[PDB]
Amino acid sequence: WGAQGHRLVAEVADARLNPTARAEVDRLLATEPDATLASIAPWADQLRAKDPGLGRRSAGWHYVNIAEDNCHYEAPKHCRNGNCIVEALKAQSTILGDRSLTDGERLQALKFVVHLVGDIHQPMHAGYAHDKGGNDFQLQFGNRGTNLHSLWDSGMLNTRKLDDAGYLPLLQSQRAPKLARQSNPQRDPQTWAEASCRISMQAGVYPATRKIGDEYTERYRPLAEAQLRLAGENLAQLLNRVLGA
Template identity: 55%
Template sequence: MRALSLALLLLLPIDALAWGTLGHRLVALLAWDELDPAVRRDIDALLVGEPDPSLAGIANWADELRAHDPDLGRTSAKWHYVNLGEDGCVYRPERDCPNGACVVAAIDDQTRILANRDLPREQRLQALKFVVHFVGDAHQPLHAGYAHDKGGNDVQIQFDGRGSNVHQLWDSGMLNAAGLDEDAWLRRLKALPLTVELSQPALPPDSAGWAEASCRIATQPGFYPAKATVDAEYVQTWRPEAEAQLRRGGTHLAALLNAALKR
């Protein structure tokens, strides 16, 4: 099977679906700081009436759909990931994203909706919520990894004294183990050197390239822990890569939004 089954995906815990609440908020917060002032104003206008009218406030909305909109949650379940590990981390739409049901196509499709100012505000707001979340997903290596182990969900480990799996380890386990609050994490990530090269913001975004780069991380030797109990050495080796991906995700999201909402 090349992808997570919908039934299994809907049974997974929330923090096994993406970066976890903290990671997605951090990607959004990093992006906000890199947005053009006019784009910030457009986003603020779209967010009027939201419970938390901020980019970080909507960053986890797509993972919460199962609770407040189960039908849309089922429809969008496959939009969170793409399986490239078995195929050399090379994305081919007809093979890896049938009917546009993967994170690469979802980013492109929702960006087009967001950029279309002729569409209703509600439709564009929903697209913004999807885009913010899915760009984060595309930078989580296991969202572009192997199909055979369901993005690391089938690889059981012990971490921090509890049972877990490799997907959860990367979603939130390694980040939470650092013991930092959101503000401290944001300062830490902003201090990282930017390891992406950006030309002028343009559409469509390089969503396939982001997924392929994530896949190359997930398929590196040593990415999967060699021991069932994950030790400090693994965390010291790999958490910097997770941090770098969050940093890249924020910059890529900012470039996408600057391009989609430019006037």
């Protein structure tokens, strides 16, 4: 997602934390002046942008391209050296839960968990390796040149013309998604990546033309918005497992 998608995932999650995970999240956030679950949600993208070390080391952690293998994940093939979102989210979930670590270490792991639960629910972050998750599929959206990756990260969300305070209750108005009956932080990432991959491969998500507009938005923006709600609810369920147990 773009920044707004990441914030909205965190805002949906923040309201669903159990009292224990509430207190532990607040304790870790207070070690960074003015940090909220929403405000840190885009951080992993700004790091990858600007940081010559962790930014370069974590750039592959935002995605996993499994569409050519029909959305069947294999860690050795699709996540060499743990360099994809499935293994990165598993490892950062373990680090975040490790109460023997410093507040600094666990807050950084929280920033990755908040961001990556967002990104693992963005269909184009689990798509084709060969076109870089739709980045190479250039297309005209209304009168504006963009690409299929950007369309799903922010282009369709931007058409609502809502700030976070307007967009949040819209997402909360949806019927509740069915989650796993129990969080398994080591197994659920593969499930989520595969599900996001299957959406990238659904009929029409890759359009038959390179000029699209209102028809595409009206069909697929509701799916993007369902994915933000699902991501937010899965993030709360994970944080309640890792920090609220």
